[PDB]
Design a protein around this ligand. Structure first.
Ligand SMILES: OC[C@H]1O[C@@H](O[C@@H]2[C@@H](O)[C@H](O[C@@H]3[C@@H](O)[C@H](O[C@@H]4[C@@H](O)[C@H](O[C@@H]5[C@@H](O)[C@H](O[C@@H]6[C@@H](O)[C@H](O)O[C@H](CO)[C@H]6O)O[C@H](CO)[C@H]5O)O[C@H](CO)[C@H]4O)O[C@H](CO)[C@H]3O)O[C@H](CO)[C@H]2O)[C@H](O)[C@@H](O)[C@@H]1O
Ligand SMILES: [Cl-]
Lengths: 1138, 214, 107
């Protein structure tokens, strides 16, 4: 019944889901190259607009309400067909004529994801009606209609076709959501008769102020292709038509939802098709409307111009995506399409570079101006042209000898196309596609994003633009604080931090525990692979700075006493930053020193800052203590903040410190140079670990655990207190590189020991642990459920052998994390929550052995306890937690009858409350709901992290020449995890188009939350790994070991790609080959008898070698996007394919 | 169509199965029907009535209020034809709120709320319990939901119950339904399914009671 | 009101249709040095010329305060500084002639 096929629709390739109406309706995003947004259900319900929800063409509501609105909002079509002497009414896509006809519903979405087609075949009449949504930068939304008569009959048809519940310009999304009825009273919908154009406006902008409020813009709709239609500008007469009656034209309707309907009569001959289109746009002023009315009346080629602008949209989309290596052609179009959409969601969320490594002087100059007024006035930019390269900027920067200019030049990232990732299925996220200027509609180079979201997206991005890696690293490091954390957002301007609300007690700020180590590390690994020795050149270079986030992490004894109350907002420090920002610009948000308006440190110091912060929270055998008033990756386990401890972060810290240790061993420097203030901190942490090394021979006692945490935590506390209170003085001291290597080696000894104490009997590893302070002298550890995140982390740690990695995965597959129906992985075990009648029952014994509770029973008091009519006892139904119970006990104590007893038995009743509800075990909402991160739900990003981790484990096994059994069994895991991701699943099992990413699939539905998930970043890296694209020692290697034979073409095909110079070009592929791009160079793999690589250059030469590793220089020609290399062909042995 | 009263009848006529769904717009002009609306002189009772002229069947439901019991929906299915019908009916109320959702959250973030829904049937009684798995709260602390909305019924012999609208469309398409007692992640509903033989010039009656804050 | 044989609070009246609310006369434009300069320089912060040669106030204006705000924005440019101070009362006066906000009693 429900199949998916590649099909040709009007000479373009689409995926067709046949009988999509047999699926529970699923939600999609239709992507544009421009600023269109469209969120649409498979049933046709939608919201759409341009830029943001404040310019909605159709109302912006949550995805459930959108799906539920298909009958009254959006596309609507009714046909009165003359058949014999009968008038027959057909209303495709509606539920108004249930089982009246045999029908087939099909749904199509194109390979680019910017067009969707809805189709209904009326089998009884042999009629098919299609409509398709397209985007046009110039014209807005375009709905292309086709009515096709494939019968042998001739029909007289009266049709009514259009769009309804059209928003007028100027209604806020909040008002439309909460007060839609009031808005109706201000609606005026009008037709311009000369043109047939519909104008949808308000009589006045709705405003609480008692002043004039003119509404001088409108939404519009118009059409082409129908002869002499009658128009409706409302849905008032819709039902009359539905009941086989004729309609009256409307040109001026007040007080009603806007609509735009065309009515015409026609004779549809057998084996013929009639076509028309409707165009709708938002945010139109008088001049915009007149230009359209003039074009309708005077421009005989208007239809052709619309079609041209639609195709330009696709073309611009391809250029954006192709520049991040979106284009692949294999035997498997599903994987090809999934790679394209993966790349698009990655660049939509993190951005894409404007034009290779090219920079415009105007934009660069404004950036410097906003950043630092004193650098801007000092540095003369005459010597740069209107356009210059990143290498030009670097050569220029080296002549200015200004470390602030060095930093700002290096941080500059000419990204465009990024937007925050809100939509009706993520309605708590406010989105805005700010990609065309309010002024002239030209491109906007800007970006903003949440810390972990954007730095994740950039890891994938960097692979297509490697020479920007330095920029990204400086951006990350320089936006990090001296106490080793970071603000929640980065922007082109700089960064933003969260503030406190009102005097609201439940409003608090902090730092996320995962934000630093793993995301930094992926960048450091990348640069050391592409440019070995480059990090070494930063070791002594004092060009890095400290982000001044005005958060005060409290003294150690206060944290230990209450680890949920650990960070205060420093309002006086905010005053100083605001003054500096008025006076310098964005650079005013950096730490000054006593001497210098901006304090500068080197790379070694920055790594120490973040590493000492982590080590200062290291609880041996437990992990990194979570005590910074924010969780890590999983927001649904946010209650672990306080007594929770992250082994996840420790596994990554192992990888990090192993990397750093290798980095230092390869250095020739004998010394390091760090802030004087850091010396005591650094030395105290190092010394603590050194003198406790001997404990690693065995397990560490609860007593020793606390001795160690106390020394580490006191040392950090002393350091931050000094800096918070007297700042950095500006003097640095020289210490030995050998000491730093010693610090790194001993830190690793402790971490390794801790990892070995964290294996479960089933061979999984602990993810998050609990700590408690016992007898003021000890720290005890307890454990939580098996969690997927812990397995991803330990498998990424670099610590285990290949056999051990395999044992972990065998355990994972055999564990309660494996979900059978989707053959993928939960975040934690599914579990039965107590049914309503089973959650709140106090044992008869506990009641009769409590004088307080017994007294409340016999006196019929129901403030705390109640007896039902079968004799069972319950806590008051208003209680959410113990605080409500305590509150209630306070209320009882202000009565004479209960006063003595409250003081006596209150701890006891609180203890009975804890026995019933077991709130000590609460980790967060994860364990108490049934979607998103909750029970029985697959959260795909984490599965895709597993996949990448397992890929890395596979490469290790191959590179170390493990047995074929071990390698094979790891591959078995790799390919199964990959299959679980679901690209080859049926639509009915996937629950949507399998080529589109979604954030999660809950137990009782298909895929939920379309588009911009971080999952896509992981699946891009995995695809590159799978293709055998490896960079080591500055050298590009193209040498697949995980790639399957069945990816190679079975027939000849044409690969249409885009060069680095925006040229749309073609290569002919033959059987036994495939193609992709890397740094936007086309790469062809062909099966051959001998290994060989052939590099074709722009000068018409080619060069061959048997080796599939390219030299440093050729590799930098690839990475550099200079256009010197036209293509690369790799000849691969059949025997090396899987 | 998706919230409140919903009624679907599968009627055996000759050897054919006929689906009738009064008060809906799901079967436009499938039948000659008359819809009548009644409100009493005191303004505290309302009756919705649909006469299916083709079958000579009338369905009425009436909303009443009870201080003790909450809302009471009194149903009457009346056969004024000369025919005898085997009827499988599915009747009830849908998009029942669980206790403890603020009107602001239901207005702006209805989708998030679904993820916390759990609808249960008490088998011995047939009573439906509509609650959350937790009160939805921005704080990082436990939040027990210790009250519920309820629905229950009298007058039908040995009914099968749904506590959701998941199977509504199968029934609409003339298929039979499976009993439900525990549905997670979905809008609450309370449906009764029974089979009966409705003789000519006879009337069957039942009621559904729903209350809040239990 | 005939159809209900009862009484309105005040007369029903035809409000200008969308394309009829915001048109500046050809004469008022060519007898304003400021507006004419903004036209020939293609500045659209205050005034715009459509493709049939009719003139309109910026579509973002709700009332004179948005106009004043926009004139402040123009005055922080050297090209328009002299002219803002000179002709601002005049441009506000043309705005009042188009919209007749002196007659506004409420919604
Ligand atoms: O539905 C519930 C059910 O779901 C199941 O999951 C199904 C899922 O697995 C399936 O996905 C297919 C995927 O598995 C497949 O992967 C294969 C891969 O296994 C294969 O690996 C080989 C190794 O097998 C081999 O190892 C050998 C070793 O075992 C032996 O002991 O020693 C040998 C040496 O002495 C050693 O060689 O080694 C070779 C390399 O040397 C590996 O290649 O490799 C092939 C390709 O080479 C790979 O294809 O891929 C398919 C597509 O390519 C996937 O379709 O999909 C089903 C859905 O259709 C899922 O149901 C779960 O497994 C069950 O537990 C659940 O109950
Ligand atoms: Cl937001």
């Amino acid at each position: 019944s429900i199949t998916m096929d590649m099909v040709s629709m009007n000479g373009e390739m689409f995926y067709k889901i046949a009988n999509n109406d047999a699926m529970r309706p699923f939600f999609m995003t239709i992507v544009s190259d421009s600023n269109h947004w469209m969120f649409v259900s498979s049933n046709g319900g939608l919201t759409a607009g341009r830029k943001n929800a404040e310019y909605a063409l159709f109302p912006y509501y949550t995805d459930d309400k959108i799906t539920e609105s298909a009958d009254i909002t959006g596309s609507k079509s009714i046909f009165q067909i003359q058949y014999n002497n009968e008038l027959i009414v057909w209303e495709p896509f509606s539920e108004r004529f249930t089982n009246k006809f045999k029908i087939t519903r099909n749904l199509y979405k194109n390979y680019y994801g910017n067009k969707i087609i809805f189709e209904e075949i009326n089998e009884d009449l042999g009629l098919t009606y299609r409509y398709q949504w397209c985007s046009s930068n110039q014209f807005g939304f375009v709905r292309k209609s086709e009515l096709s008569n494939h019968s042998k009959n001739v029909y007289e048809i009266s049709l009514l076709d259009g769009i309804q519940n059209i928003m007028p310009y100027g209604v806020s999304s909040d008002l439309q959501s909460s007060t839609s009825n009031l808005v109706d009273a201000y609606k005026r919908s009008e037709l311009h008769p000369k043109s047939g154009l519909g104008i949808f406006a308000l009589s006045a902008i709705i405003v609480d102020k008692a002043e004039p409020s003119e509404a001088l813009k409108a939404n519009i709709a118009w059409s082409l292709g129908l002869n002499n239609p009658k128009y409706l500008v409302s849905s008032l007469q819709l039902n009359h038509f539905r009941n086989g009656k004729s309609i009256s034209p409307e040109d001026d309707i007040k007080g009603e939802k806007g609509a735009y309907f065309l009515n015409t009569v026609m004779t549809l001959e057998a084996n013929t098709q009639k076509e028309w289109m409707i165009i709708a746009n938002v945010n139109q002023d008088h001049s915009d409307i007149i230009a359209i009315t003039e074009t309708i009346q005077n421009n005989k080629k208007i239809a052709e111009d619309i079609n041209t602008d639609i195709e330009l949209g696709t073309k611009r989309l391809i250029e954006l995506n192709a520049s991040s290596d979106a284009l692949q052609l294999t035997a498997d179009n599903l994987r090809d399409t999934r790679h394209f959409s993966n790349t698009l969601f990655n660049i939509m969320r993190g951005g894409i570079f404007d034009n290779n490594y090219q920079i415009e002087k105007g934009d660069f100059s404004n950036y410097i101006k906003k950043a630092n007024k004193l650098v801007f006035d000092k540095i003369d930019l005459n010597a740069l042209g209107e356009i210059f390269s990143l290498n030009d900027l670097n050569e220029f920067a080296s002549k200015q000898k200004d470390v602030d200019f060095d930093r700002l030049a290096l941080e500059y990232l000419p990204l465009k196309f990024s937007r925050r990732h809100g939509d009706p299925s993520r309605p708590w996220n406010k989105f805005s596609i700010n990609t065309q200027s309010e002024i002239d509609g030209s491109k906007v180079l800007d970006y903003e994003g949440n810390w972990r979201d954007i730095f994740q997206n950039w890891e994938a991005l960097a692979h297509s633009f490697p020479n920007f890696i330095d920029s990204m690293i400086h951006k990350f490091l320089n936006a990090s604080t001296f106490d080793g954390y970071n603000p929640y957002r980065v922007t082109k301007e700089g960064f933003d931090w969260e503030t406190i609300e009102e005097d609201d007690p439940w409003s608090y700020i902090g730092y996320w525990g995962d934000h630093q180590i793993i995301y930094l590390l992926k960048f450091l690994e990348f640069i050391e692979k592409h440019q070995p020795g480059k990090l070494h050149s930063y070791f002594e270079s004092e060009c890095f700075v400290y982000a001044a986030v005005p958060y005060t992490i409290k003294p150690y004894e206060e944290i230990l006493n209450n680890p949920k109350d650990t960070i205060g907002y420093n309002h006086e420090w905010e005053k100083v930053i605001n003054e500096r920002k008025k006076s310098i610009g964005a650079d005013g948000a950096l730490l000054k020193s006593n001497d210098k308006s901006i304090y500068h440190v080197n790379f070694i110091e920055k790594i120490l800052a973040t590493v000492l912060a982590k080590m200062s929270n290291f609880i041996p055998e437990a992990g990194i203590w979570l005590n910074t008033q924010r969780p890590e990756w999983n927001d649904a386990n946010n209650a672990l903040v306080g007594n929770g401890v992250s082994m996840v972060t420790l596994y990554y810290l192992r990888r990090f410190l192993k990397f750093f240790d290798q980095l230092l061993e390869n250095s020739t420097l004998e010394n390091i140079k760090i802030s004087n203030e850091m010396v005591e901190f650094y030395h105290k942490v190092r010394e603590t670990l050194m003198e406790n090394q001997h404990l690693l021979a065995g397990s560490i006692s609860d007593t020793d655990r606390k001795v160690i945490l106390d020394k580490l935590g006191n040392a950090a506390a002393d350091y931050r207190f000094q800096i918070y209170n007297s700042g950095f003085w500006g003097k640095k001291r020289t210490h030995s590189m050998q000491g730093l290597k010693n610090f790194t080696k001993v830190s690793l000894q402790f971490i390794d020991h801790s990892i070995k104490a964290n294996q479960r009997p089933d061979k999984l590893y602990h993810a998050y642990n609990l700590m408690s302070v016992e007898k003021n002298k000890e720290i005890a550890i307890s454990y939580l459920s098996e969690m997927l995140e812990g397995q991803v982390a330990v498998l990424s740690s670099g610590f285990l052998s290949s056999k051990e990695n395999l044992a972990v995965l065998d355990g994972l597959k055999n564990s309660a994390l494996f979900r059978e129906d989707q053959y993928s992985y939960l975040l934690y075990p599914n579990k039965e929550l107590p049914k309503f009648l089973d959650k709140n029952t106090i044992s008869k014994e506990a009641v009769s052995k409590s004088e307080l509770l017994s007294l409340l029973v016999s006196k019929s008091n129901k403030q705390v306890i109640e007896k039902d009519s079968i004799g069972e006892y319950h806590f008051n139904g208003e209680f959410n937690n113990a605080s409500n119970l305590k509150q209630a006990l306070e209320d009882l104590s202000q009565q004479n009858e209960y006063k003595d007893l409250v003081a006596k038995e209150s701890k006891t009743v609180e203890a009975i409350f804890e026995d019933v509800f077991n709130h000590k075990a609460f980790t967060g909402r994860s364990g108490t709901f049934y979607g998103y991160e909750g029970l029985g739900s697959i959260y795909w990003h984490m599965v895709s992290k597993l996949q990448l981790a397992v890929l890395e484990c596979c490469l290790k096994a191959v590179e170390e020449k493990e047995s074929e059994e071990v390698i094979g069994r790891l591959l078995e895991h790799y390919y199964e995890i990959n299959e679980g991701i679901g690209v080859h699943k049926s639509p009915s099992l996937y629950g949507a188009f399998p080529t589109d990413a979604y954030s999660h699939t809950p137990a009782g539905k298909g895929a939920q939350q379309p588009g911009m998930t971080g999952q896509v970043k992981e699946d891009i890296l995995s695809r590159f790994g799978e293709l055998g694209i490896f960079v080591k020692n500055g050298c590009l290697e193209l040498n697949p070991c995980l790639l399957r034979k069945d990816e190679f073409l079975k027939e000849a095909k044409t690969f249409d790609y885009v060069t680095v110079n925006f040229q749309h070009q073609s290569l002919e592929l033959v059987e036994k080959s495939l193609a992709f791009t890397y740094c936007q160079i086309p790469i062809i793999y062909k099966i051959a008898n001998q290994k060989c690589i052939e590099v074709f250059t722009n000068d018409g030469k080619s060069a061959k070698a048997a080796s599939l590793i390219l030299d440093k220089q050729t590799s930098q020609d690839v990475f550099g996007r200079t256009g010197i290399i036209n293509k690369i062909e790799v000849s691969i042995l059949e025997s090396d394919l899987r």
